[PDB]
């Protein structure tokens, strides 16, 4: 029966059937957004949902027999396992993000349709050549985050009061988002020289990011 | 009479006469902006306007005899047909965007003048090689837009209340426009962890956009 | 006497004596900023200023005998001429931008010193390759500025009330500066669909802008 | 005894030992952030801290016997000396930024670990090729900063009242941060034409900046 199901799983129809359900379940998840729709077809959709969830475990179960160890060494497959897994935790208990993290299954359209995998893989592949920079930056943030917490956190605890707060604020400055009228001009009403901390922070961080982009535009 | 008009239409004079009317109508539309001007010469320019609109239908009518089916397979010609057609719909009924959309005809200066045509075409040609990325993104947006509506839309309905609103807000975050003091700092007063939703969203979307720019700097 | 002065003019000393005066007049113009400094040594630097202004006209006169027609076909010389001409208009009458435009003579440090000229020339030379795009954009801005004035200027006359106002706001939207919470979210409280005007405007303008950068990265 | 210690210093175990203390001290400084941790184990931490500072001077002392002049001609060694030196100034007196600048020793992780050195070096090396542009820009900022101080500083002293203030505001405009609703629209309520100063400022500075990115993307 192995080759029987190995012929079911590997079949064009099987895959296209899965893809058909995803786009349907995707359409169905945008409708569960509407408080109106839920009042008229909420039941239609809750069951349709639980149904598709089974079909997917069945598939994932099947795909495993047909592949065994080869499966748990496939990025894309591991993904669909964990994603379907999330959607299996009963609609209750623990955290309610789990109910919300269900919509992660629509990323299966990326997993199950080639070309996406190409582009996603294309994208991801660039990351290894960025790890040296990403490490460098995280050290830098961490250092400045520590300096800021202890230079500005007493008077400005919303923004710099905690190591993590400072991390966040520094991120915002780095995205150059309201950094001046939002953060630094206020700071300077108390700490006139704060511009000496933030202009150098901005130059470095922006410089680094240009280099990183240029590097990607080489490799 | 065909070759007679085919020699009228294809003539340098004809083409240059059209270009002359556009820059004239374009000048005339900027003046229709002034409430002052309209109170003095509004009559002049309403008639001048209907005149140019006739001339353009005549031209578009002529151009169709001279080209027949070759014409309704020309992007640039199709454009002008539609753009002129909009300007034909009476100054009444339906909506008023149709009165306003009339100004789209000044895009004929792009259509009726090469180099422009070249440049526009140069640009557009870059699009097909982005469609794989654009699909990826629109999937990503759609996924997060749904998550956001159901995680933040109850307490923050102006921003995430509806799927469409989440889309808009997510767009704004993507343009990195007032994203922190504007959206996420507020969100965190109620949902401390919202940063776990928006920082990842920012990284991915910015990464992807950098890739897409680099892709265009290859092809 | 011609070659006598042609030998003074072309002397390394002469050109270096000029460069020496620029850096002094530049140093001296930053000090004129201080309300304090002016109360002490104001009279010192008003004369020192007028002194240098003479010297530069003497030079520019000298530079003209030595070069004649050749001089008025030199960008850098024409510049130097107009920038000194501005500085001769009597500290009085007309507009007082003329008093302020005097600080443009510090751009003579760009003229008088090579490498700067190289770099400036390097930059400027990239402009002609951009004029097709720049033309395209200005047409596009013009078209939308008109739609916006007539779509939003009645209710929102600060931002769209006038063609020029619309230009400015559109520019601001193009720099992506406070565009959502600043302009469009307001606009939508009255005109729900305004997003249909601004999201497309944003795509096109950012797309084009990316293209333009990449072109400057292949030429 | 020289070669004995030259064999100690150059030892793999030595270098790794140093790298070990940095990650330990770096972890330690993040905990010194916690007002909680300090009440608990503050004592534990200040001694462990002084200990490390001892160890590091010994190393730098040792490192010097083993390299003499060669050491004070090594960028990375100079850094480590100057960094440990900052951390040597007693926990008292003068400026308290000195207590804060201590955390700069975590940059020794860049210094003591290669690949980092590589990447930093990679980055830093791009700078020389940018000094013509950086010069061009600084002259530009200086010139406009002066015009702005004298054009707007009387009515707008927070933003333009002083040369340094103007420098700051101009930088903020250059980062395109809140530049319109934050600075120029205000400005225009009094000085209708201020758009004539800031749009050109914005064009030039953004133009130059794009060039500088491309220059890097070639060299
Ligand atoms: Mn902004």
Q: Which helix (H) or strand (E) holds C50?
A: helix C35-67
Structure tokens of D148?
């702005």
Residue of D97, D107, D168 with shortest CB distance to A195: D168
D78 part of contact set with chain C, CB < 8 Å:
no
**A vs B: CB pairs below 8 A:** 70
Q: What residues contact B182, with CB distance under 8 A and at least 6 apart?
A: A178, B172, C180, C181
Q: Do B33 and C150 touch (CB under 8 A)?
A: yes
Residue of D104, D177, D216 with shortest CB distance to A180: D177
Closest residue by Cα to residue A136 from D121, B93, C48, C168: D121
Residue of D179, D207, D213 with shortest CB distance to C177: D179
Structure tokens of C52?
């240098």
Q: Where are the domains of chain C?
A: 1-114, 115-219
C149 part of contact set with chain B, CB < 8 Å:
yes
**A1-114 carries CATH number 1.20.120.350:** yes
D147 part of contact set with chain C, CB < 8 Å:
yes
C195 part of contact set with chain B, CB < 8 Å:
yes
Q: Do A139 and D171 touch (CB under 8 A)?
A: no
Kindly provide the resolution of this structure in angstroms, with one decimal. 3.2
**C vs D: CB pairs below 8 A:** 72
Separation of CA C214 and ligand 1 centre (Å) = 24
Q: What residues contact A136, with CB distance under 8 A and at least 6 apart?
A: A208, D110, D116, D119, D120
Q: Which residue in the block uniquely carries the two structure tokens 């767009």?
A: B171
In C, minimum Cα distance to B172 occurs at: C180
Give B116→chain C minimum CA distance, Å: 7
Among A129, A143, A177, A193, the residue to mutate for chain D (most D Cβ within 10 A): A143
Reduced to 3 states (helix: H, G, I; strand: E, B; else coil), residue D177 is coil
Residues counted in chain D:
219
Burial letters for A180-201: b for 16+ Cβ neighbours within 10 Å, e otherwise? bbbbbbbbeeebeebbebbeeb
Q: Which residue in the block uniquely carries the two structure tokens 């010193």?
A: C113
Closest residue by Cα to residue A183 from A200, A208, A158: A158
**B115-219 carries CATH number 1.10.287.70:** yes
A219 part of contact set with chain D, CB < 8 Å:
no
C-alpha to C-alpha distances, B142 to A26, A82, B105, C43, C193, nearest whole angstrom: 9, 21, 34, 68, 20
Separation of CA C9 and ligand 1 centre (Å) = 51
Give A100→chain B minimum CA distance, Å: 6
Structure tokens of A15?
């895959």
Separation of CA C169 and ligand 1 centre (Å) = 14
Q: Do C100 and D132 touch (CB under 8 A)?
A: no
D133 part of contact set with chain C, CB < 8 Å:
yes
Closest residue by Cα to residue A120 from D107, B207, B95, C53: B207
Judge whether C23 and C112 are in contact, CB under 8 Å: no
Residues counted in chain A:
219
In B, minimum Cα distance to A34 occurs at: B162
What region does B191 belong to: left with phi over 0, alpha with psi -120 to 50, or beta? beta
Judge whether C77 and C63 are in contact, CB under 8 Å: yes
CA dihedral C181→C184→C189→C192, nearest 10 degrees, is -140
Other Cβ atoms less than 10 A from the Cβ of C11: the count is: 11
Judge whether C177 and B180 are in contact, CB under 8 Å: no
A210 part of contact set with chain D, CB < 8 Å:
yes
Q: What residues contact D49, with CB distance under 8 A and at least 6 apart?
A: D25, D28
C-alpha to C-alpha distances, A109 to A17, A76, A180, B137, nearest whole angstrom: 12, 11, 42, 12
Q: Do C163 and B107 touch (CB under 8 A)?
A: no
Q: Which residue in the block uniquely carries the two structure tokens 């402009």?
A: C127
Structure tokens of C133?
């795009």
Cα separation, A205 vs D176, in Å, equals 16
CA atoms within 13 A on the CB side of D26: 21
Give D3→chain A minimum CA distance, Å: 35
A88 part of contact set with chain D, CB < 8 Å:
no
| Residues of chain B found within 8 Å of residue C176, distances taken between Cβ atoms | 175-177
Cα separation, D145 vs D135, in Å, equals 15
């Amino acid at each position: 029966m192995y080759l029987r199901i190995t012929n079911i799983v590997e079949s064009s129809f099987f895959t296209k059937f899965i893809i058909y359900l995803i786009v349907l379940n995707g359409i169905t998840m945008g409708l569960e957004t509407s408080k109106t729709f839920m009042q008229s077809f909420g039941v239609y959709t809750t069951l349709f949902n639980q149904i598709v969830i089974t079909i997917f475990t069945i598939e994932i179960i099947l795909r495993i027999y047909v592949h065994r160890i080869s499966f748990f060494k496939d990025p894309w497959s591991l993904f669909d396992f964990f994603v379907v897994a999330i959607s299996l935790v009963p609609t209750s208990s623990g955290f309610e993000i789990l109910r919300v993290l269900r919509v992660l299954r629509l990323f299966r359209l990326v997993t199950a349709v080639p070309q996406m995998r190409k582009i996603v893989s294309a994208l991801i592949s660039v990351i290894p050549g960025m790890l040296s920079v990403i490490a460098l930056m995280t050290l830098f943030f961490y250092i400045f985050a520590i300096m800021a917490t202890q230079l500005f956190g007493e008077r400005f605890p919303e923004w710099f009061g905690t190591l993590g707060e400072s991390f966040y604020t520094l991120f915002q400055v780095m995205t150059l988002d309201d950094w001046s009228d939002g953060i630094v001009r206020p700071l300077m009403e108390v700490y006139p020289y704060a511009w000496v901390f933030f202009i150098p922070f901005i130059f470095v961080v922006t410089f680094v990011m240009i280099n990183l982009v240029v590097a990607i535009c080489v490799d």
